[PDB]
């Protein structure tokens, strides 16, 4: 009567009926999102009551099971994932005042709206009246205005609320044996147990900082040519030598620098790659191209696409009397139930997005042999990176001459290729610096590192250090400006975004090394090649039964994250840089201000 | 005189795996093509004798066993396989004379919302021997001990299979049956025409 063999019989009941309500509740999911009405709302909700009563009731039997007396790995990885002790360790009162907390800061971001002076109807909501004048606009008085404005009435509503929030989370980290919240976050990227292959929760810390080190020196570059366009856009509202005003970055919060690239192109005479209009002309339609995504999948070794997917997908927007969210996603209801939901255009973003959310549904296709709490990625990661090599490699010229869709008679020029590489630079560089910037400011304020009266000017610092971005108007400390991000506010971590773009670039080197490419990475296709695709579906496979490390190493041979693919991908580019700069200064100075 | 093809394979209810039912056969002239325009057998596999040899041979007795499985799990019903349904419901001995016939019947065993009216067997102490059945209703105490309610480490042994339409096709019905024939130095019952 070992506890080991007492604990097998427990998960497989565990498993057995898991499958059944995750199946239930998946169902009214999909007949709610497809079909909207009251009652499909009323029967979701019942749905997914019942399996967070069940899954609660099976967490507080578990525990009986101590975790020091099993070998089993397997056991183990799925006692602990079911262990964990979630919020219901504060008493009743606290978690009431917590769940109450979230839920108004939720409404408040979602809800707040802002307007100008002297118009008192005309008030704009953010989606779609902020972004638009964020996005599009080019006077500088009216992106100032909407900056402050958004940033100064409903940040305001937003610090006294943040305050307690976070120490109410703190606690509750401090009574599941953990150094903070910060710890609890970072608890994601741990393993420990076997030899060879262990990682510390503190160690993540590190080597991020090791790998930003490295990037610095491009990053910089990109940074110095952006300012020097912008001088021609606003003449005399950037110096030479300093940072780059915050309300002039394209988007609200300087997270993508996407929508500058129509005042930074090099060569404009030049358009870029379109292939919509010979779509239009050979009667393309949705079906098509699922069709041909399947084939470009097939083509690899990977299997294709049972009938489910095919009878009970929707495709095309139902239109008519029916609303459905047109959201692009991939089910996996369980069972042998895979689907997918979009809105399909006839477009070439469409075409990209179809391969990326395929590559999501033969992800998730690859582990379904593994028992029900391993079904899912190794990490936070890597899900989305398998989804973006295939978007990555379906978009070169060389693939779509195949498919018949390019004429043969065109020929690329380097120009072009300059062009294709700064518009992929201006979304996946100009990203990191400000991901890194955030998390660590979170890291260190649930540390005790920042006091509360020091977190604004704490915040407008490392701006000015690493990211290189300036403030147009001096902040009090009554302001909560990180608050404004949906991210922050609704209680969602932020690395992932960095160890997702960074394994992305890893596992392509890798896979074209196996496909006997010859030239830049940057024109590199997986098609026929069944090398590739059995590299790729050893990892696949494994699903969380095995540490992220050996799931690494059995494609690029390494045990660690590494940055040298990017830089190999992106080296054209920045020899590029590196001669038009030449009468530039790179580099910035904090001293400087738009308002000093 | 026909033989009852379309008795056994066309039954209204088939029972559950735990409570299987045996049939046996009297004289008869086997003639299969009575079943040909009417369904396709998505398995179809004997072991000691070829199929196509079943019109010149005449067996001593034979039986019918019908059930209802899962579609992974009719893999499992093969002389010398292991798992759930072959240790604890149904077994099969090494040295096997028989054929084995299994086809897909979810338009009528399945439906939008579930059925759960087949039941089989997950927990038991001992594995099976050939040709048993097991018809307890105990609570399986893990390590042998004594308990009289349903709680903690205390598990009944019967739980039911769930069948949904939309469901893919290694979880969609089956419907299987095992027909065992003897050769023995007694008069032949069933002949071939
Ligand atoms: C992958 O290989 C197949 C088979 O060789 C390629 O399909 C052929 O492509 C050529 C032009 O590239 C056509 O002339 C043939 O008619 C196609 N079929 C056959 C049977 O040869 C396919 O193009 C390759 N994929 C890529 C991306 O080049
Ligand atoms: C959408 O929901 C309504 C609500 O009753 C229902 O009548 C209708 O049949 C549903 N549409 C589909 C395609 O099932
Ligand atoms: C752990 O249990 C599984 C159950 O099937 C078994 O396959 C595996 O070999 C066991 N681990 C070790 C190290 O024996
Ligand atoms: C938290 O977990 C530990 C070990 O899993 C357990 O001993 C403790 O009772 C749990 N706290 C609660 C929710 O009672
Ligand atoms: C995939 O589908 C095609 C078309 O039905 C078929 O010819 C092929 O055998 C299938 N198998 C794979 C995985 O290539
Ligand atoms: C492209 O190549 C030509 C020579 O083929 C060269 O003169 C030109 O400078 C190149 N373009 C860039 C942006 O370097």
Redesign the interface.
């Known amino acids: 009567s070992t506890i080991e063999e007492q604990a097998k019989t427990f998960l497989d009941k565990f498993n057995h009926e898991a499958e059944d309500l995750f199946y239930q509740s998946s169902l009214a999911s999909w007949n709610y999102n497809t079909n909207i009405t009251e009652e499909n709302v009323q029967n979701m909700n019942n749905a997914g009551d019942k399996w967070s009563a069940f899954l609660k009731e099976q967490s507080t039997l578990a525990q009986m099971y101590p975790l020091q007396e099993i070998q089993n790995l397997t056991v183990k990885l799925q006692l602990q994932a079911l262990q964990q002790n979630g919020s219901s360790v504060l008493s009743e009162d606290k978690s009431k005042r917590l769940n109450t907390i979230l839920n108004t800061m939720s409404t408040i971001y979602s809800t707040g709206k802002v307007c100008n002076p002297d118009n008192p109807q005309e008030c704009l909501l953010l989606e779609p009246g902020l972004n638009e004048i964020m996005a599009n606009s080019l006077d500088y008085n009216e992106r100032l205005w909407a900056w402050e404005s958004w940033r100064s009435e409903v940040g305001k509503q937003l610090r006294p609320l943040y305050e307690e929030y976070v120490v109410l989370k703190n606690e509750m980290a401090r009574a599941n044996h953990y150094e903070d919240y910060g710890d609890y976050w970072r608890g994601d990227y741990e393993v420990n147990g076997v030899d060879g292959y262990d990682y510390s929760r503190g160690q993540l810390i590190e080597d991020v900082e090791h790998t930003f080190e490295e990037i610095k020196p491009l990053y910089e570059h990109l940074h110095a040519y952006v300012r020097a366009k912008l001088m021609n856009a606003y003449p005399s509202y950037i110096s030479p030598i300093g940072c780059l005003p915050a309300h002039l970055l394209g988007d609200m919060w300087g997270r993508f620098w996407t929508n500058l690239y129509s005042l930074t192109v090099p060569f404009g005479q030049k358009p870029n790659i379109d292939v919509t209009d010979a779509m239009v002309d050979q009667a393309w339609d949705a079906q098509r191209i699922f069709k041909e995504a399947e084939k470009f999948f097939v083509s690899v070794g990977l299997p294709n696409m049972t009938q489910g997917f095919w009878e009970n997908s929707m495709l095309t927007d139902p239109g008519n009397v029916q609303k459905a969210v047109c959201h692009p996603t991939a089910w996996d209801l369980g069972k042998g139930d895979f689907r997918i939901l979009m809105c399909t255009k006839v477009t070439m973003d469409d075409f990209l997005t179809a391969h990326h959310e395929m590559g999501h549904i033969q992800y998730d296709m690859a582990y379904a042999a593994q028992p029900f709490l391993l079904r899912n990625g190794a990490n936070e990661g890597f899900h989305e990176a398998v989804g973006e090599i295939m978007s990555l490699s379906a978009a070169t010229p060389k693939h779509l001459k195949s498919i018949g869709l390019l004429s043969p008679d065109f020929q690329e020029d380097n120009e072009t290729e300059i062009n294709f590489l700064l518009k992929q630079a201006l979304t996946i560089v100009g990203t990191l610096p400000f991901t890194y910037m955030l998390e660590k400011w979170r890291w260190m304020v649930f540390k005790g590192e920042i006091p509360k009266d020091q977190w604004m000017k704490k915040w407008w610092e490392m701006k000015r250090e690493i990211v290189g971005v300036v403030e147009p108007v001096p902040h009090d400390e009554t302001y909560c400006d990180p608050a404004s991000l949906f991210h922050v506010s609704n209680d969602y971590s932020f690395i992932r975004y960095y160890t997702r773009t960074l394994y992305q670039f890893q596992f392509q080197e890798a896979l074209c090394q196996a496909a006997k490419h010859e030239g830049p990475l940057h024109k590199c296709d997986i098609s026929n090649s069944t090398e590739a695709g059995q590299k790729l579906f050893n990892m696949l496979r494994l699903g969380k039964s095995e540490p992220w490390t050996l799931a690494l190493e059995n494609v690029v041979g390494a045990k660690n994250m590494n940055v040298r693919p990017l830089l190999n991908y992106f080296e054209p580019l920045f020899t590029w840089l590196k001669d038009q700069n030449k009468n530039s200064f790179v580099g910035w100075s904090t001293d400087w201000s738009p308002y000093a | 005189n026909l033989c009852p093809f379309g008795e056994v394979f066309n039954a209204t209810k088939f029972p559950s795996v735990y409570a299987w039912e045996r049939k046996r056969i009297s004289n008869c002239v086997a003639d299969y093509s009575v079943l040909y325009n009417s369904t396709s057998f998505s398995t179809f596999k004997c072991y000691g004798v070829s199929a196509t040899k079943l019109n010149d041979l005449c067996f001593s007795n034979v039986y019918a066993d019908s059930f209802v499985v899962k579609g992974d799990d009719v893999r499992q019903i093969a002389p010398g396989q292991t798992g759930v349904i072959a240790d604890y419901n149904y077994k099969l001995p090494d040295d096997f004379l028989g054929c084995v016939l299994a086809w897909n019947t979810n338009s009528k065993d399945s439906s939008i919302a579930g059925n759960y009216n087949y039941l089989y067997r997950?927990?038991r102490r001992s594995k099976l021997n050939p040709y048993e059945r097991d018809l307890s209703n105990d609570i399986y105490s893990?390590?042998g001990?004594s308990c009289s309610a349903v709680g903690?480490?205390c598990?009944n042994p019967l739980?039911p299979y769930?069948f949904?339409t939309?469901?893919?096709?290694?979880?969609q019905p089956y419907r299987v049956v095992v027909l065992s024939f003897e050769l023995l130095n007694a008069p032949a019952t069933v002949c071939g025409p």
Request: charged share 5%.
């Open positions: 997950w927990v893990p390590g001990q903690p480490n598990y739980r769930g949904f939309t469901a893919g096709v290694g979880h």
